[PDB]
Amino acid sequence: AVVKCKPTSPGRRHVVKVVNPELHKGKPFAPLLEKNSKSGGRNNNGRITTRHIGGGHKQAYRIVDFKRNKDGIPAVVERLEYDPNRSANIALVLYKDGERRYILAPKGLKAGDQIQSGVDAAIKPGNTLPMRNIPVGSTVHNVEMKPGKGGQLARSAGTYVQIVARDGAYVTLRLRSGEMRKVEADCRATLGEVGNAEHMLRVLGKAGAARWRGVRPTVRGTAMNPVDHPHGGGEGRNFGKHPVTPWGVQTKGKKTRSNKRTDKFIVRRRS
Amino acid sequence: MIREERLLKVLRAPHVSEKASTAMEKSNTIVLKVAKDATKAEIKAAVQKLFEVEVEVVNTLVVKGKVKRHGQRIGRRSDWKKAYVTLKEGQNLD
Amino acid sequence: MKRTFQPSVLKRNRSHGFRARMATKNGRQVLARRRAKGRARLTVSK
RNA sequence: AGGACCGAACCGACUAAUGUUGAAAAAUUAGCGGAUGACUUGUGGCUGGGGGUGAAAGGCCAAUCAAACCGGGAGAUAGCU
RNA sequence: GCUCGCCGGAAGACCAAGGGUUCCUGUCCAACGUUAAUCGGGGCAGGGUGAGUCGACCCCUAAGGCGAGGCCGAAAGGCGUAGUCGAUGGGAAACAGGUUAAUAUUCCUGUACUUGGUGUUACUGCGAAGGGGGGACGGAGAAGGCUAUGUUGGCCGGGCGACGGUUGUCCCGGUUUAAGCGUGUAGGCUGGUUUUCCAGGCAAAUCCGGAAAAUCAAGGCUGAGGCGUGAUGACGAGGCACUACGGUGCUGAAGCAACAAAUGCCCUGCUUCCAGGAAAAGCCUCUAAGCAUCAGGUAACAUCAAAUCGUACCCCAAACCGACACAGGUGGUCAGGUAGAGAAUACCAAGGCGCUUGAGAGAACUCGGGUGAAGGAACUAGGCAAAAUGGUGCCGUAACUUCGGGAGAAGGCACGCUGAUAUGUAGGUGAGGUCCCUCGCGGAUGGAGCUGAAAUCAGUCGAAGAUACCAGCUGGCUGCAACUGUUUAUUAAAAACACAGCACUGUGCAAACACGAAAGUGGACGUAUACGGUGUGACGCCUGCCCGGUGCCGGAAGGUUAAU
Known part of the structure; x- marks a missing residue:
């Protein structure tokens, strides 16, 4: 259910929340939690390999069953839960033999349903x-x-x-x-x-909302200096060149797929 | 059982001071100068065997050497260990 | 004003200490140079 | 409830005066902005020089930055003083 | 030694970090102290740091480092598995009084507690490199019960006043007691117990998880504080005496009650929200190999052990970081009285200082302030700077608007003290006395005593009652930027950067991209409602014409064209 916040302050004036009354209002399942440490967008050499990542609220990893190999044993849905690791919500399901697992939540899934x-x-x-x-x-x-x-x-x-x-x-x-x-x-x-089809309808409202999800600000190339980016420089606002990445490869239209190994499975490219 | 010759090397000298005399006459505790690497058990055993006195408990502390100045040259005195040996009630020592 | 030297013995030893120098080839070369030069105090360690 | 309001600690430095061989190689006094947040801080760690990092000023990287510092090529070269 | 002044949410007290004897005593003034110096953080000599319980060491891990084998790389070397380090976080236990010139939760006195061996007795399924629980966790807000602590009354000891009054509704001081043990309370969480069965927890399991069935609504876990004990003790205002006038010795009364109240504790709680909130060990339990009346386990008692290192001193500073005894910088803990909403502000207590040159004189001029006739921005680039407004309650408040704001708009009234309502009210707290009870730290009635706003009426003083410090100047038009933020540490805080939103483009996962000669790693344990790059910057109305040039995308029939 989408709700529009009242404009009692700037930064809240444009917020539209997506409330879901079915989600569990408690702590997640302990035998399935595990550590998920942040990285800051830095690889094992310590260098930033992808910018605008860092900070944000601490998150724990939920072990979601993606393989789905428990065959023949029916399971009832105990409850729906919020998952910070992904956009979709997850569901805590209980199998007949007493094993609990986490699965992705479908569109029409409510508490008490049977899956197999x-x-x-x-x-x-x-x-x-x-x-x-x-x-x-x-x-x-x-x-x-x-x-x-x-x-x-x-x-x-x-x-x-x-x-x-x-x-x-x-x-x-x-x-x-x-x-x-x-x-x-x-x-x-x-x-x-x-399930969570209305997740795209939400609007963050303020800069801090994006900061809470570990997304650092994005600096436009034209606002920099020539040593930092190809687009930098200019007494005023000047952009007399074709748009390229910080490392010199064109962005407005140039294709970059170079995987000949999997070309045999692509029947027709996207439009 | 700590060796006898080791006991014969643990104790270095009696510490003579106003506080030491006060402790000796009031709390029945003698202040000894011991080897820097001596443990409480070694000090207790050494006093009990060589001096023939009953030890109640041993308390130790390490004393840092002062940085002195011989003329113009800056030097440092050696660090030493100090032990408060508390003799049992009724005991007497020189 | 906060000056550039904010001392910490733990950081000092972990950055310029003897074991830190001996962990890598270049640190040992620094140690070799100082030994050749005849330095009284080889490293930052007390 | 809120990157909400007034306002201390804390963080910062908008205006003026003083000081410019200063108490200080950037601070003091009177005012000033934020003050539950994109806040601030302690401890430890990681990213190394054509490299890092940057809510982007070519800013910062030990009072040094349109390419740090230390050693070496090195007594560079200098139609110049 | 007697006055004066200053700080007192610090300019007081205790730590960590950092320093390393600067701590205390005797002695000296050549050099250090911006002056003298008998003094010192200065010189010389002596002394001073006492731990099973405080901290480190130790057991355990986060980010991260190193890394047997291993993969990769001209060599050096890079990454990384099993492991092993790494606190800033998890893990056992001590408090009160006294004493030194200098140490004290360490010494002494009194009273405890914890973890390990051994050794006798009683009882019997023990055992992990494995499984489960627990440790174990976010932000904000609201009460209720407390405590540290303070005020007042009562009690005890002392006083009857250098000047009018002071045997009383007077003055000064004290009225303090811990850890532990027992009780399990205000309050929080959960339905307990037994039996049977099972594709789960890599095998097993009586444990955890899942299905049934029967029985009982009352059992279990957590928990501040209070009370009893610890305590016939210690401490205690003061007296009695010596003295090196520094201090030492002996004795010792009251030691209760009510009220207010934390930011501290119950509370790792409760309610609510999205941004969805470490790991591992200690601890409890379960069994696999194995051990079979052995080893082991738990209960009591006795005995032994708890080593090693730090403990002085500064720690918002004259001792650390700044070349200085430097108007600078430095994290955590304690938080008294009155006025005040308050940790702001003013004056004080406990406590500590007067900032290591002074003495005169009272010129111009400079700095920091006070006041000003008549005028009120005429000054100036500009009301720069000064001056002015400033609190609480109430009346009242416009354009415009995204309906939230603007707004404390603007403008104005009341404010001190005393009495009456009421010799202290409404409200809060709550003792005796009565009754009930599954009986205790219980509940209803009951109002003593204590505390206590706000309002109305009347009166009274000054020019002035928010009397001091503290503490918005207000309004109108308009350019820019939506806003809060960020930025050139050291001449630029802005219209610049960022921002949520919009659009284009790349990317089907061994993804694009990025750091890497490579292995690999981030992206991401994410999957087109996602992630990266580019331009624009909330919201309202919109985004129109041009592919000739330069890029990019799609096509491959023809011309031209490399190595071979």
């Missing part, structure tokens, strides 16, 4: 089956790229893919980017879209 994985699971939102038994045309999420590796595609707040065709050992999926990609028919996938 495996080749013989029913076709309903939240169940996970290999996509050769899943009907063509259906929208699925948390889909694997190699059999048994775990979901890598369609994992954000409100994304999905459509299985548009199947030809022998491979199927063709229409990815969220508008690109058609082939993938093996033995990869698992979960039925239905993923």
Whole structure:
């Protein structure tokens, strides 16, 4: 549910919150928490390899089950939870044998629902089956790229893919980017879209909101000096050159994909 | 059991001072100068064997040497250990 | 005003100490140079 | 509830005066801005010079920065004084 | 020694960091102290740092470092697994009084507590490099119960006043007591107990997790404080005496109650929010190999052990960082009285200082201030700087607006003291006395005593009652930037940078990109509602024409074209 804050101060004047009354108002599950230390956008050499990262509220990693290998054992949803590590919310599910796990939350998932994985699971939102038994045309999420590796595609707040065709050992999926990609028919996938669809409708309102998520400010290239960026320099506002990255490669239109190993699976590029 | 010859090397000299005399006459505690690397057990054993007195407890502290000046040359005195040996009630020592 | 030298024995030893110099090749070369020169105090360590 | 209001510690330095061989190689007095936050601070660590870091001034990197400091090539070269 | 002044949320007291004998005593003034010097943080000599409980060492990990093997790299070397370090965080235990010239939670007296060995007795499934619990965690806000602490009354000891009055509703001082043990309270959390079964916790498990069934609403965990004990003790205002006038010795009364109240404690709680809030060990429990009446485990008692290093002194400074006995800089802890909303501000207590040249004189001129006739910005680049406004309650408040603001808009009234309402009110706190109870740190009634605003009426003094310090000047038009922030440490705080929002573009995961000759690492244990780059900068109305030039994207039939 989106709510618009009243303008009682600047920085709150334009805020629009996305409240979800179903989320657990407590502490997360202890046997599944683990450390997630920040990096500042710095690699093992200590150099900044990607700018505008640093600071932000401390976060702990929730071990989300992406592989989804507990086959044949039904599980009931204990509760929905907020996850700071990703845009989508997560759900704490309890399997019949007494093992609790974290899964991504689908669109229609509420407390008390029953989910199941495996080749013989029913076709309903939240169940996970290999996509050769899943009907063509259906929208699925948390889909694997190699059999048994775990979901890598369609994992954000409100994304999905459509299985548009199947030809022998491979199927063709229409990815969220508008690109058609082939993938093996033995990869698992979960039925239905993923839940927090209104996450894109929120507006942060103030600079501090972006600071809380570990996003440092972004300095425009034209505001710098010539030693710092190609765009720098000028007595006034001058930008007489074609837009390029800080390291000299063009940005406005130039393609940069150079992976010939996986070109054979891209049926048609995005639009 | 600490060796006898080691006991014979732990104790260096009696410490003579107003505070030392006050302690000796009031709290039955003698102030001895001991080796810098001596432990409380070694000091207690050495006093009990060589002086034939009953020791209650030993308290030690390390004394830092002063930085003196011989004429124009700056020098430093050696660090030494100081032990407060508390003899048992009724005991007497020279 | 806060001056450039804010002392700390822990930082001092961890930055210019004997073990810090002997950990790497270049520090040992510094030590070798100072030994050749005949320095009384080799490192910052007391 | 709030990068909300008035206002101390704390952080900063807008205006004027003094001081400019100063009490001080940038501070003092009277005012001033923030003062639950993009705040401030203690301890320890990481990023090294054509390199780092920068809410971006070519700013800062030990009173030194349009390329630090120390040693070496090195008594560089100097149609100049 | 007697007066005077200054700080008193510090200019007082205790630490960490840093310094390393600067601490205390005797002695000296050549050199150091911006002057003299008998004095000193100066010279010389002697003395002074006492720990099972404070801190370090030790057991455990974060960021990060090193890194057996290993991968990569002309060599040097880079990254990294098992490991092993690294506090600034987790882990066992001590308080009160007295004493030194200098140490004291360390010495002495009185009263405790903790962890390990051994040794006798009683009891019996013990055992991890493994599993689970716990340690274990965010920001803000609101009460309620307390305490440190303070005020007043009572009690005890002393006093009857250098000058009018002072046997009383008077004055001064004291009225203090801890750790531990027992009780488990205000209050917080959770339904307990037994039996059966199970694809989970890499194997097992009686433990954790999940299903049923039966039984009982009352069991368990956490918890400040109070009370009893510790304590017939210590301390205690003062007296009695010596003295090197420094201090030492002996004795010792009252030692209660009410009220106010923290930023400290219950509280690692409760409510609520999104930005969703370390790890591991100690500790409790479970079993696998193994150990089979052995080893081991837990309960009592006795005995032994708790080593080593630091402990003086400065620590918002004359001892640290600034070349100085330097108007500078430095983190944590304690927080008294009156007025005040207050840790602001003024004056004081405990405590500590008067800032290491003074003495005169009272010229110009310089610095920091006070006042000013008549005029009120005529000064000046500019009301720069001074001057002025300043608190609380109440009446009242415009354009414009994104309906929140503007707004404390502007402008104005009341304010001291005394009496009556009420010899102290409304409110707060709450004793005796009565009743009930599953009986205790219990509950209803009950109002003694204590504390205590605010308002109305009448009266009274001054020119002036927010009387001092403290403490918005206000309004109108307009350019720029939405705003709070950030910036040229040391001449520029702004219209510059950043910002949420908008748009374009790249990127399908062994992603683009970046640091790396490479391995790899960040991005990210993220997946197009994501991440990076570029331009623009909230919001309202919009973003129109041009692909000729230079880029970029798509196409490959033709011309031209390298190595081979």
